Amino acid sequence: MYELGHFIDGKRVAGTSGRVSNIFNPATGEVQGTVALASDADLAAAVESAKAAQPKWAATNPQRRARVFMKFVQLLNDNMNELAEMLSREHGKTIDDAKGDIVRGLEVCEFVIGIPHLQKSEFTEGAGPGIDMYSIRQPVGIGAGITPFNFPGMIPMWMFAPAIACGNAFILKPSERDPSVPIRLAELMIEAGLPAGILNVVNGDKGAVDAILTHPDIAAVSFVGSTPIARYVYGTAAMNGKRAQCFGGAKNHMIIMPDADLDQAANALIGAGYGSAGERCMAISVAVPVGEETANRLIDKLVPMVESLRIGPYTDEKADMGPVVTKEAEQRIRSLIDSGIEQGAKLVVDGRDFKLQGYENGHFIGGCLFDDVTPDMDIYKTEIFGPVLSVVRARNYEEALSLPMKHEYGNGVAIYTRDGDAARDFASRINIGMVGVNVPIPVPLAYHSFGGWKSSSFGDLNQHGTDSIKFWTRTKTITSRWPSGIKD
Amino acid sequence: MYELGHFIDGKRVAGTSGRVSNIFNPATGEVQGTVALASDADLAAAVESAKAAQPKWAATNPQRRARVFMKFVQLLNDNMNELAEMLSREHGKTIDDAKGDIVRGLEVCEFVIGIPHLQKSEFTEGAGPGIDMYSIRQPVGIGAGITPFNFPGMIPMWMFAPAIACGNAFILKPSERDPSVPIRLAELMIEAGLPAGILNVVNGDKGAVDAILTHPDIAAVSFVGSTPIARYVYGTAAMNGKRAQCFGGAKNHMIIMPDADLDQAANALIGAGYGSAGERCMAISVAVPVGEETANRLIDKLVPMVESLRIGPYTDEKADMGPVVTKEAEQRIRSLIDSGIEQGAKLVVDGRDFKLQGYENGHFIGGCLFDDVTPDMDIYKTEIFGPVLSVVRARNYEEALSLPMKHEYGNGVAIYTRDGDAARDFASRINIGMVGVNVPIPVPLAYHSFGGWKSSSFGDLNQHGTDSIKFWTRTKTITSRWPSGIKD
Amino acid sequence: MYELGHFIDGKRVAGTSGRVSNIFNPATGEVQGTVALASDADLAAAVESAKAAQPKWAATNPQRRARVFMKFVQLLNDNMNELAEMLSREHGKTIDDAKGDIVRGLEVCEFVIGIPHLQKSEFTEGAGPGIDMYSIRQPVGIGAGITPFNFPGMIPMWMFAPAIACGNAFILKPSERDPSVPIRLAELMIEAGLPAGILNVVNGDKGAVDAILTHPDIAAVSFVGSTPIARYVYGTAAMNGKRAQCFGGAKNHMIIMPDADLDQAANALIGAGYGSAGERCMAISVAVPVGEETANRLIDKLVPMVESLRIGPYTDEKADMGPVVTKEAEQRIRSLIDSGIEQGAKLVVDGRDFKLQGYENGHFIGGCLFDDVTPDMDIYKTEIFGPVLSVVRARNYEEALSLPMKHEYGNGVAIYTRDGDAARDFASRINIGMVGVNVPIPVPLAYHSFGGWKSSSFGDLNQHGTDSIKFWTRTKTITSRWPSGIKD
Amino acid sequence: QSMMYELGHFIDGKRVAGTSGRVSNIFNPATGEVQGTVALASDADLAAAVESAKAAQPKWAATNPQRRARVFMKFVQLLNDNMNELAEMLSREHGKTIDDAKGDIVRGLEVCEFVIGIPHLQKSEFTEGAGPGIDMYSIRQPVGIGAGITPFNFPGMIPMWMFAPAIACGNAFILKPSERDPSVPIRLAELMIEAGLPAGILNVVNGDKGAVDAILTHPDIAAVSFVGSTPIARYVYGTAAMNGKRAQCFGGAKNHMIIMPDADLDQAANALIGAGYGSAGERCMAISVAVPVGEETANRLIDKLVPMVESLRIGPYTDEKADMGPVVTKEAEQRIRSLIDSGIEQGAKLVVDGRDFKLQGYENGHFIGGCLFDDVTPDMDIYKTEIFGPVLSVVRARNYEEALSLPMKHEYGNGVAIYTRDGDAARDFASRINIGMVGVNVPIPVPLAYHSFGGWKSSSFGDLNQHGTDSIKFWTRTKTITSRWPSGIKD
Ligand SMILES: NC(=O)c1ccc[n+]([C@@H]2O[C@H](COP(=O)([O-])OP(=O)(O)OC[C@H]3O[C@@H](n4cnc5c(N)ncnc54)[C@H](O)[C@@H]3O)[C@@H](O)[C@H]2O)c1
Ligand SMILES: NC(=O)c1ccc[n+]([C@@H]2O[C@H](COP(=O)([O-])OP(=O)(O)OC[C@H]3O[C@@H](n4cnc5c(N)ncnc54)[C@H](O)[C@@H]3O)[C@@H](O)[C@H]2O)c1
Ligand SMILES: [Mg+2]
Ligand SMILES: [Mg+2]
């Protein structure tokens, strides 16, 4: 049994709350450790540590700040196997999934190496007679980020890389479900040459989150998670006068046109639907074949691929898919699957009976596939976040388009087609922030930016890319002239 | 007596609430007209009108959208006299001030002529193997803007020019104190070739604003006004999931170093302290001379010039200054002046007695100058928004800098000095968004961006400049590839 | 008979060389006027004028400079018919063509209205300890532009709009074939409020070009014309230490894939092949159908449309196409046509017979269409610049792509297809600067940039867009710090 | 001469010998002795390097930007690991101190750091609905194969200036470095291979004018970048353009420091010592002219400078306390000595005379003592000519306008500096001067890797600077696509 505390001022520390939460191993269903839940006083200590450290860090030139990230990237590559094992053991996903998690975080770190260029502001000479005008992008001061269970490496680095690169200090409040990676990341930042107090990790639940939102020394909050919590963090942050960016849930659709490469479409669906047991806000949860023949041919190819998925713990490196994160998630998913049957959807692949020998207590659910799903059913309206894929049969292109158009969620969407007209038209019109053309998971790369539309995000600036530099800096504008003096 | 309604769908329309507010001529103190206070039906009609028109507007190419602003700029020039007259008549400020108000709005309209270039997004070829990745900046849809009494031309234009250039529809809720100019602007947009429904004006008070904040079809809200109301709007907009940018109050300081051009500092203090009867969020309301000799010489120069300010109605074109906007504002200012005297400050120029013959009921206050002001006084802590300049004597550079630094407000600040070290150091350290070096009112031009720090703004994007374009657009990122086909 | 001189220092002035050049009315073959050919002395006078005015102009703020362009755009709209008339009368093209010529130049003027944003440079705070680093984009001084016969409005404006917006003085040496428009444009710039001497027009031939290339006070040269002369001007300018951008000839191919809309492609070929009598470096001169059926079906649709082209003077407002610019041009084209026949190509529409009643001395040639053209033929290798379209039957996709790939010219190219894969692959791989997907004449808009590859351009910066702002400015970088002074 | 080493070329991931059997001698300038030789490329040697580049470039251009950037991240780490070795070989051929050599390498390293951001930097522009259903977008694609010609004084920094953005952008690159000190460039190319760059993407071709002409007339090389003297820059620029190539060339300097009466004179004098005599003045950003304003400023400045010039520690790279080493060649030494003589015979006052200086045990080294001239006027050779040696000239200016007009009127416009406390004087001076790089209380205003380097007037040719975003522009060509679709299977 291991006990995680917090990471403050360069050290792992125990905290003072007398509160803990259990860390499970979701493959066995057993408790493997605890994590401390920060009190308001523990949060205050992290803020005071960030306050004491931030000015010297902001006073370090951009090139030197960038060198910390360069060093950190090498450390990540050096510590990859260790990081992935601790991630998988708490989260449930495969070693390869876990490495992908780390790698996508690493890529934001690579991006912020370019902070000297990225943080440039604008200069105008002769805005008026002898008058120059120029901006400067200065740190906001102290930022905080709140992250979900599914990417405990990538999403923290999404936020802390640009925030710290811009010369802010940063308080990370990660998911209490799987907190080993975030602490290890902050430890590695120290090893990379980051001053103590610039990246603090404060573990906790709602209590720690409320403490962050109400602290008058925190300037900016970044959130990734479910839509209901995203709304609450966004509204509350604003109510406290802070800047905020929040990113929510999804029900990503893949539309399949009759001219599409059906083999590639089926392959994309198995990976996008069932990768990480469907625990992704960019999982494809709805497949929309256009026309009966397309549906039938696609289902024909897809069904066997779902049935032959290898399910197992992270120690089995041959497995395609692991358990879901908690018993609660398991039960919530199972209840949703039952509602699908009850409401008239056809469960073509039924995974409810799956048990893994030796792991009967793990949070394991077999792959599920529903056909004849309709927009009024719960399995369609609700983000399931499990290995459950729904097929809605569309009669034509306009009908197919209107499905993701009309959904509450607008995170990601995909269209599979050979037709340039269909792809252009669909990607132009859809009210969804991230679009795949023959690409099933259209997550933009670290140097572009990430953000959904509709109920999938709140605020006006995305994750990473240039948007992140904007979010973590305040603009100062100077207008400048001089009286005539000694030159005359 | 005139009776202003709303401007919805290309025309002037009567309100349907049955409630009006009184429009005063501040120079005589009598009612000259009324303005309707929008009901929910009024806002709903404005939203429906916007919804009907926005798609075809967004589908118009950027160069064609730009040509509308082209035309509009010419129409503003042609109608300059008429616009200035109606502005001054309701506001109080001089015709010259009213032209300035309009022209600074006009310059945002010129800036957005560049919308084809401004709206460009980013393309990457070969992000992956055969994969291209690119963003598009699309309209948010329908936006709203809430504006204050003091600039009913400029500030409406600040918001609606980029909002509309970006392909959005825009609902203006201007100050009910002086709503003539806003309706006339919407009318001139129609004459410029703007489609009906794209710029709508809904007049009203807290009622209209709350309707705007809670209407599910408005995506974005921009606010300029007092800090308390900015706090409210920012929080409420966010609680409803909207993007928001809010800009608040001020207590702008000018620091005068002993090496400064004192003649120019003193002239700048007359202009910035007493222009518009001090009714500006970029008015200088604190003069911070460094050293006794600097303070005493500055007082020597200011006294005769504050005393000789010519005060009068807008029909008097020699007047340096007009009346304040309402009886309420006047009483608030006079009350704060009294507290200055009560709390020990030295009223070296007393304008309390000033009366204008023929205009005995107008809201006229003579220029006031306080010396020996300290930071514990009400006249120092509170934004007065009137013709009251306070002098706080600092002993050295560090004492002087700490004054605007510790202030609750952080809109603008100025430093007067011949010394490059003092200027650079001051501009770099001060926690204030807009800094002037030998410039009294460092309002950036339309092509740079406007926004204060601390309690002077909320959100993460400024007014106009490229910030505004970011605020009025949402980012869509497409990831794109193709299966082998007919080319093979 | 009319006599054109030069436009120097705000005035139409006479040439002092005594040498003149004939201006033809291509529709009748008669001489309608003469244009002065600049001496070395005439050029020197224009440079002395430019040198005298540029400092004051560069000292004018970017908003004021932009306003000149705003007024100019209105003056162009006001004078459209007169401009188009003088253009068509000297060039030969239709009024509608001439209006397009002027409009596209007008669009560059609209783009440079945004010069205050476009000319921004970069700022870094704390590049070192207490050290700031920032660039300024300042004028190059005096530029020159050399332009060809076919777009005597658009091309001059391409060059002088950004040159002048950037704070430079500009010397235009337009084509002596049709010099009425360029002078009128200079005159209108004056009316728009441009100071005298900022835009001078120096008419002439090689003599004037050589005088520009060897004048020590001209910093930069822009050229558009034939490849042989672009090569000469690029080399000579550089041997004289000038910066240079030169843009050359073309042999634009259109690839028609078997899945293309053949109606649309044939219609596009008529406009792009025969518009302006094919006197465009973005004209399609080679059609490349893929497959036997595609070629046969295409030839079939084209023939009746080529046969029924309406050919007349600009005074016949029903005409689709006018005469070519000179008898020299006409003899060259006819000579090329004959070479096509003798080299084995099938002439399926023979325009050689064409004569127009009452216009027997006009430079009229009927539309020509060849089939079975192969890469070894002169009509394939040589830019014809006449109404002669060549069809090259491709067997497959790779064969079709290799045709424009291997051509010495690489100005524009187009692919007609419904297939995303084919479109993307062709566009990505082709060694040609301007690529159309279902667009026959992919000339970028003013806010993007123009320029070919291979033999079609020389230098490292394109015409208009942000490229042009880069070409007409030089970068200065300031590194700045201050010693400890009075602030301490 | 002892045991000499022999450098050839670096082509396709390997050191290879020259096929011309012509060599150039490599000296140790501390001793004056030959220590090795370098091969001078034939046309065939260059042709081999171009063919090498041609075969390899397409696959490298097809590698995604993030993967290209990682080669540079690894390379940066390799530079740090090999810093001491790299500095040693540089100093031994060039003359400058080990610390100088490390700064040379570090500034090259900083360009490699900047091009790690190539994925963001290479982005192009997109417009939706430029017309009805019509989209318009650009792509920045490789030019193909570039070449760079570099001078003796920074054989690490300058090659990296050029090859880092060229290679990050997806091109292959042929470096032709100075034959004076060719060890570093080849070792850099070796380290690029060790960092994972494919063979043939960075080739090094050693040689003289012959190799340069072979570069300038090779039809497969699309772009040339040159840094060196103004006469050769003119030649490279013109000839490149004659051959249809794009080119950017960077030339000589005569950098002035203007000292206002209100300046921190002690900081100015200290700055002049470093900027005037660092690397024995062999820098195109060395201050070679001081311009004090007014009598007292001049007299006091001179008085400060004299004993600091006199007490400079001069020695070989093996003496780690030296401020300055020998100049690069015998030729360079003779030319510096001729120019010093010219100053005396044309009337300048040689207040510190370094002509006599000899170092015990290094009598044949190219060592010259620090020199300082007062009462220099604009008609003298020491003023008009770039000396490239440890010779500082003091021109007395009576006022601000006169002080400003000296760098204004000079043929060269590489760098300039103004020392003052006055915001007005600095702003005005920096705004008006016709010189590309300006220091305000900064003696050597060389911009950082993420900004850009370029002089004005005679100091540069072309329209794009070195490094910064300019370099990304220079190493890419713009393609624009205009795109629409006909009614399809969606209808
Ligand atoms: N350009 C400038 O000078 C400038 C810029 C920013 C802010 N300001 C600020 O404007 C203020 C004075 O103008 P004002 O009196 O019009 O400001 P205000 O805050 O009273 O009103 C601004 C807007 O909010 C609305 N509003 C007022 N009370 C409300 C309530 N209780 N609930 C909801 N909405 C409400 C008003 O109708 C008006 O449209 C000063 O504090 C000043 O700093 C001025
Ligand atoms: N950062 C810097 O310090 C810097 C920057 C730019 C320029 N410089 C300049 O470098 C110059 C000194 O260096 P250098 O002596 O190596 O310069 P150089 O001009 O003699 O040589 C530069 C390059 O050109 C080649 N070359 C020389 N002569 C040639 C000819 N006749 N034809 C073709 N190619 C030829 C050389 O082989 C070498 O690679 C100074 O003028 C200085 O201003 C220095
Ligand atoms: Mg297949
Ligand atoms: Mg398997």
Side-chain angles (χ1 to χ4, degrees), chain D residues 150-154 176 179 209 226-229 251-252 284 386 388:
Chain D
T150 60
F152 84 85
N153 64 333
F154 289 97
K176 194 260 92 159
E179 62 270 41
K209 181 184 204 296
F226 172 97
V227 173
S229 66
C284 75
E386 183 184 43
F388 234 57

Side-chain angles (χ1 to χ4, degrees), chain D residues 21 41-42 45 95 179 200 210 244 250 262 265 309 317 395 401 427 433:
Chain D
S42 64
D45 292 328
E179 62 270 41
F250 305 83
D262 70 332
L265 217 66
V309 185
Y317 75 97
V395 179
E401 289 299 329
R427 191 270 177 189
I433 193 63

Side-chain angles (χ1 to χ4, degrees), chain D residues 107 149-154 157-158 161 176-180 207-209 212-213 226-230 232-233 235-236 250-253 282-285 386 388 414 453:
Chain D
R107 292 216 268 145
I149 303 148
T150 60
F152 84 85
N153 64 333
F154 289 97
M157 178 181 84
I158 303 179
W161 268 9
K176 194 260 92 159
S178 176
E179 62 270 41
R180 300 287 82 85
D208 53 14
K209 181 184 204 296
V212 171
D213 292 338
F226 172 97
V227 173
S229 66
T230 292
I232 310 306
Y235 171 83
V236 171
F250 305 83
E282 301 174 307
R283 302 189 48 174
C284 75
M285 298 291 282
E386 183 184 43
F388 234 57
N414 218 23
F453 177 105

Side-chain angles (χ1 to χ4, degrees), chain A residues 176-474:
Chain A
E176 59 278 48
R177 299 289 80 80
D178 44 12
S180 293
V181 170
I183 291 165
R184 188 56 182 144
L185 297 184
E187 205 166 48
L188 287 170
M189 279 292 273
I190 295 306
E191 198 177 327
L194 191 74
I198 297 302
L199 175 64
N200 291 327
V201 178
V202 179
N203 287 298
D205 61 6
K206 176 168 217 313
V209 171
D210 286 335
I212 284 163
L213 292 165
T214 65
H215 208 293
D217 295 326
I218 293 168
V221 184
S222 189
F223 179 96
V224 169
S226 68
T227 288
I229 308 303
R231 286 186 190 277
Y232 173 81
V233 167
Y234 186 68
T236 308
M239 275 298 178
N240 283 267
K242 294 172 169 52
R243 55 172 70 177
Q245 51 165 207
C246 304
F247 304 86
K251 192 82 182 176
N252 287 18
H253 295 52
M254 182 194 296
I255 282 67
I256 306 94
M257 292 302 291
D259 70 332
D261 188 328
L262 292 191
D263 283 339
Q264 294 177 5
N267 284 352
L269 278 173
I270 193 67
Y274 301 93
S276 304
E279 297 176 312
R280 301 184 57 168
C281 73
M282 301 289 286
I284 294 295
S285 49
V286 182
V288 182
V290 184
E292 282 294 283
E293 205 204 313
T294 306
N296 294 351
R297 286 205 64 218
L298 188 66
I299 304 285
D300 235 15
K301 300 155 114 56
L302 185 54
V303 169
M305 292 184 198
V306 179
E307 292 189 356
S308 75
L309 284 173
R310 191 180 166 105
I311 303 161
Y314 76 95
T315 47
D316 173 25
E317 304 197 296
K318 193 187 171 69
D320 303 304
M321 193 176 100
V324 299
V325 69
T326 56
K327 177 61 172 178
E328 289 70 29
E330 196 193 328
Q331 293 312 123
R332 188 185 174 276
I333 294 160
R334 288 184 185 275
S335 148
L336 279 158
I337 293 168
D338 278 351
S339 81
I341 298 161
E342 179 220 72
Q343 287 163 16
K346 182 195 274 177
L347 192 42
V348 297
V349 184
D350 178 1
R352 289 173 301 166
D353 283 335
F354 181 82
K355 292 227 83 58
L356 190 61
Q357 188 181 349
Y359 297 89
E360 289 88 355
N361 243 265
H363 319 135
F364 287 107
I365 311 170
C368 295
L369 186 63
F370 280 107
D371 195 3
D372 296 311
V373 180
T374 55
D376 40 47
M377 299 184 177
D378 291 332
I379 51 163
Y380 175 86
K381 299 176 292 169
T382 309
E383 181 180 42
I384 302 179
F385 231 60
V388 190
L389 182 60
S390 299
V391 186
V392 178
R393 284 160 181 258
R395 288 151 199 150
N396 49 54
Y397 169 85
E398 289 299 326
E399 158 155 293
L401 175 61
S402 66
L403 287 152
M405 187 82 79
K406 279 182 156 159
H407 207 284
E408 292 290 351
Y409 290 127
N411 220 24
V413 68
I415 177 163
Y416 275 62
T417 184
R418 288 184 156 89
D419 189 76
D421 181 43
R424 191 273 174 188
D425 186 75
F426 185 98
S428 182
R429 290 167 58 195
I430 197 57
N431 54 5
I432 295 203
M434 294 162 287
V435 181
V437 173
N438 300 309
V439 170
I441 302 160
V443 167
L445 289 170
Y447 55 97
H448 293 268
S449 75
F450 169 112
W453 289 9
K454 300 185 286 178
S455 79
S456 291
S457 80
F458 305 84
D460 56 22
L461 290 167
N462 276 348
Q463 293 279 353
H464 55 82
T466 52
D467 270 19
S468 73
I469 314 307
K470 204 74 195 175
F471 182 82
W472 295 113
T473 54
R474 24 181 193 171

Side-chain angles (χ1 to χ4, degrees), chain D residues 220-488:
Chain D
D220 294 317
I221 299 176
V224 185
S225 179
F226 172 97
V227 173
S229 66
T230 292
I232 310 306
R234 290 188 170 281
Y235 171 83
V236 171
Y237 182 66
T239 311
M242 297 287 357
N243 284 266
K245 306 197 188 324
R246 56 173 71 190
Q248 56 166 13
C249 300
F250 305 83
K254 191 81 188 178
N255 285 24
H256 298 45
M257 176 195 295
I258 279 68
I259 306 106
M260 294 292 294
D262 70 332
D264 185 328
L265 217 66
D266 298 307
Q267 277 171 25
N270 278 330
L272 277 174
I273 297 301
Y277 300 94
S279 307
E282 301 174 307
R283 302 189 48 174
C284 75
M285 298 291 282
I287 298 289
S288 49
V289 181
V291 187
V293 182
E295 283 297 79
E296 187 183 33
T297 305
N299 294 333
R300 287 188 60 205
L301 185 73
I302 283 286
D303 233 15
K304 273 122 168 31
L305 291 183
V306 166
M308 289 188 286
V309 185
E310 294 182 351
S311 63
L312 290 163
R313 188 147 174 172
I314 301 162
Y317 75 97
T318 56
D319 168 14
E320 73 294 314
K321 292 235 170 211
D323 297 307
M324 211 177 74
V327 293
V328 68
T329 57
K330 209 76 202 155
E331 289 66 35
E333 184 188 349
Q334 287 167 358
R335 172 186 188 271
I336 298 158
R337 288 184 187 272
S338 287
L339 283 157
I340 294 157
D341 280 352
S342 90
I344 301 164
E345 59 209 340
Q346 291 166 17
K349 203 225 276 193
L350 188 55
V351 290
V352 179
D353 180 356
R355 290 176 299 166
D356 281 343
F357 179 84
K358 292 220 92 74
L359 185 65
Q360 189 178 164
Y362 293 91
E363 293 83 2
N364 291 316
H366 318 135
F367 286 101
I368 306 168
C371 294
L372 183 58
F373 282 106
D374 191 4
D375 297 313
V376 180
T377 62
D379 55 348
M380 300 189 179
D381 297 334
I382 51 166
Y383 178 87
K384 304 191 284 172
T385 307
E386 183 184 43
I387 304 167
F388 234 57
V391 182
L392 179 66
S393 299
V394 180
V395 179
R396 292 166 182 250
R398 284 170 291 197
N399 55 42
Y400 173 84
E401 289 299 329
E402 165 170 281
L404 170 67
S405 66
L406 293 151
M408 187 89 74
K409 281 171 165 168
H410 215 284
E411 178 207 352
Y412 291 122
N414 218 23
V416 65
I418 183 172
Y419 276 62
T420 182
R421 284 190 167 90
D422 190 70
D424 186 50
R427 191 270 177 189
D428 193 68
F429 181 97
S431 192
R432 292 165 62 189
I433 193 63
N434 56 12
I435 293 184
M437 295 175 282
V438 181
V440 170
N441 303 303
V442 158
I444 299 175
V446 157
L448 293 166
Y450 52 105
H451 281 84
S452 70
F453 177 105
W456 287 9
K457 305 179 283 181
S458 274
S459 301
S460 81
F461 305 86
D463 49 27
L464 290 168
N465 273 172
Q466 293 276 356
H467 49 93
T469 50
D470 271 24
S471 66
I472 309 302
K473 250 281 168 286
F474 184 77
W475 292 112
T476 52
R477 46 188 183 180
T478 292
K479 175 180 277 168
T480 309
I481 302 166
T482 307
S483 173
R484 80 197 299 177
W485 303 95
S487 191

Side-chain angles (χ1 to χ4, degrees), chain A residues 124 138 234 238 242 418 427-428 430 433 435 437-438 448 453 460 467 470-471 475-479 481, chain B residues 124 138 234 238 242 427-428 430 432-433 435 437-438 448 453 460 467 470-471 475-479 481 484:
Chain A
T124 296
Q138 293 196 312
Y234 186 68
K242 294 172 169 52
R418 288 184 156 89
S428 182
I430 197 57
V435 181
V437 173
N438 300 309
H448 293 268
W453 289 9
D460 56 22
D467 270 19
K470 204 74 195 175
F471 182 82
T475 285
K476 173 174 280 171
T477 311
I478 303 167
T479 309
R481 79 186 306 171
Chain B
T124 296
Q138 298 189 313
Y234 186 70
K242 299 163 153 56
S428 182
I430 190 66
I432 287 176
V435 176
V437 176
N438 305 300
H448 289 270
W453 290 8
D460 50 26
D467 268 24
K470 204 76 200 160
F471 188 75
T475 307
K476 166 176 284 168
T477 305
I478 302 162
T479 305
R481 75 191 289 180
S484 183

